[PDB]
Amino acid sequence: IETVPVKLKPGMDGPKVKQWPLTEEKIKALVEICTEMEKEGKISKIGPENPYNTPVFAIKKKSTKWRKLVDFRELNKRTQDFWIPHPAGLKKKKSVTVLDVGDAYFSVPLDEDFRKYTAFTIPSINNETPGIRYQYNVLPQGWKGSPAIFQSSMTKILEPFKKQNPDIVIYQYMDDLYVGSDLEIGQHRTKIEELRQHLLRWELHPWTVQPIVLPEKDSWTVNDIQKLVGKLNWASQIYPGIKVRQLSKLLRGTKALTEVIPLTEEAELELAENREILKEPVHGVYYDPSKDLIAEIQKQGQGQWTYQIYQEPFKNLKTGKYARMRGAHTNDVKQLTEAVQKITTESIVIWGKTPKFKLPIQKETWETWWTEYWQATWIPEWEFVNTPPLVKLWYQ
């Protein structure tokens, strides 16, 4: 019931970010929600002496009820660094469930001197009236300081459960609580329900770096060997002993692409050695908590997407392939949004922080539509690659 003092970083003024336009239904929903929050003392209207602003929009989570989401990215990077080792056993557990404990922050009041930095604006249509300005009087969801402050309280709330079931790992990131166990799916499901009721009083299955595979054919054409040499040449940047001279010697001459070329013994030996090399993991691949994580995403088509998480080029920490088929066949942007969310979730589970995405989409398209399919409470950083990658089929 006593606020903890919070300050910003030296030489950095509060956040002043442009509020982007919203549709009429989202504006209505934000008006109603913010009115209810105002009647509960969670937020309060402010005057023009507050120059700071943080973007806010409306989302529908996994259900029909609207939800208020605030893009606290600029505030988080401007909020002072606040002073827990990442539970490396969380990614080694059989099953992990994600819970939303955002309703617990709204009990702890926020520092009086810091509230002016949490200001946000509900925009109006056609600029006919000035926006509705609010500031947070309690701990705000999405702000990185909210879990850092509530850490002590949450530690107390979960102390009995942890002693009761010491095999269950509990991690916290933003407004989300990750609960892992190696129990049977049904056993862990009921146990998660037990943790839920314990919280009321006061589906993930962790995934490797997928290997590089080469086709196995009885007869190879010129085109097959050309693609093979190109894929092995690309893989030679990642693996030391990849050689393609005996396979390139088969392509000697000017033959039609559909013509079948029989493989020689040197070529099958070289190909076999390349296979054995690829079956081994990558040499000297470590994680650096002082470096950012980079996530690249490629569109393969037919709802299939590939992704690679790394820090240094050709040193992948994680690879995967997202191919969910739930109500997104027609919209590529929706699939990309859900794919970005899943990759971010896995990154939060493994390393405890979000990566920086390189999205295969024009900036204008993404900026226009990404909020329409966003269900997460956090927001990662992203950039846009407008040059087509050639390694597209080399990860497929």
Place this chain on the structure above:
Amino acid sequence: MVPISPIETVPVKLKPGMDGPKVKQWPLTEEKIKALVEICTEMEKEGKISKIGPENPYNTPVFAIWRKLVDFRELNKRTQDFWELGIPHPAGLKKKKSVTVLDVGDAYFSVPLDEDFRKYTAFTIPSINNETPGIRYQYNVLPQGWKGSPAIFQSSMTKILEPFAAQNPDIVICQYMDDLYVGSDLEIGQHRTKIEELRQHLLRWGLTTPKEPPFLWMGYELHPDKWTVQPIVLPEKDSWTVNDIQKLVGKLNWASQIYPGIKVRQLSKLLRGTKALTEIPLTEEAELELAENREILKEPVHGVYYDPSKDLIAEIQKQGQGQWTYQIYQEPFKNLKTGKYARMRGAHTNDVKQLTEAVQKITTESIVIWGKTPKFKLPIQKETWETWWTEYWQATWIPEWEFVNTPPLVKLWYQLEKEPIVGAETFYVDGAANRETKLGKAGYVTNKGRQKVVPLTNTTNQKTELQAIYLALQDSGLEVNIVTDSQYALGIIQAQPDKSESELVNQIIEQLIKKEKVYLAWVPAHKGIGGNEQ
């Protein structure tokens, strides 16, 4: 006296490390001095300012043009930052049976200033011949030209208008600076009654109120049933300068929101990199543009107001040379507004990408104006968009739309095969160039024995790699497989441009269009892959 309702002040602080401005006073003529003395005497009698003692060390200059002109320049450089941008667009306004304009008078002086900040607004009137101490004053209300006055007045006006608006949902009030615009569908007598109730409710807080259609507002003409822009004056000068071209472009851009078909590409190209106010002839294409635009601006064009019960529609047309035009309407032949989109600065592009960018722009503009995304009518077949987005390496999306058959239609001019072609000749191409002498070669070899190598001068490695592919397209049949080692050339062709700024790329595209099936494969260079005859 009936006491007017109290208006709570807004606390103001100066920027950190700064304090109240202490600027000396400039010499003024005796006429200016007497006028400022009389003005400040009347203002002090009205309670807007107050005589101050010498303890206050902060002062700000003041001139006279009578009208007093106090300069708060350094105080604005010392005052903190405030909130508050864009103006309401007439196409988003909703048709009302009655619309009243009320201009608040003595508006800033009606709102009090923060008492702990009045000491920093002090000014000195220079006495005659400077034989006496200058008269000293401080502002007790919002000064004219101050940084914080518009925001504080806006916030106060909102807090005052809120209860009357909540009590009268049958009227809609728009608030813009020193003006209020009240619209209602009630009867004229009930409307005027609620206007009198409004100005009485404003008079309770001490706000004085008094125009009629057509309204000349922010370069617009607002009529009861229509809206348009104020007459645009396009200057006629045989000799033009860069400042002139920029002003002409801005006027044309303004008129383009209602006048369809406005093109500014040729004139915009003239001001490329000048950055100099004084400098420009008109190319034959440009003279047409200004003459086309002069023809477009010759006839009257009016827009209508927005009806929420009707669907919102936007139709797009391709103008050529990277130019696009759109009309936003609800009923046929009655536009809410119009607009245009110019392609971004790039070396390669195609129609579908530009059409997508235009859709994104119209979508954002629509969400700003009407708060909703409109249905689109696009000159592109459903099959074309289908093939495009399914084979595009980038994720792309267009909201709900339908195909309108108004040529020119956006189409896909060529499509690369996904697999090699049986029975098609295989052209292994390659090109190289010397870095010092700028000499190079480009050629091909095929499986049937067809060969060609062409000597080239004043060329680059990339130009030769493209030239080799161009040669392979020229001498091949309707179906052809092509092998290259140029990641550059493959990267260009896989972007699928229908036009380029490079003549060689354009010729390659023209060759691609004439083909039936084309398979473009890639192999690593200098790996000893046969056929790659570097």
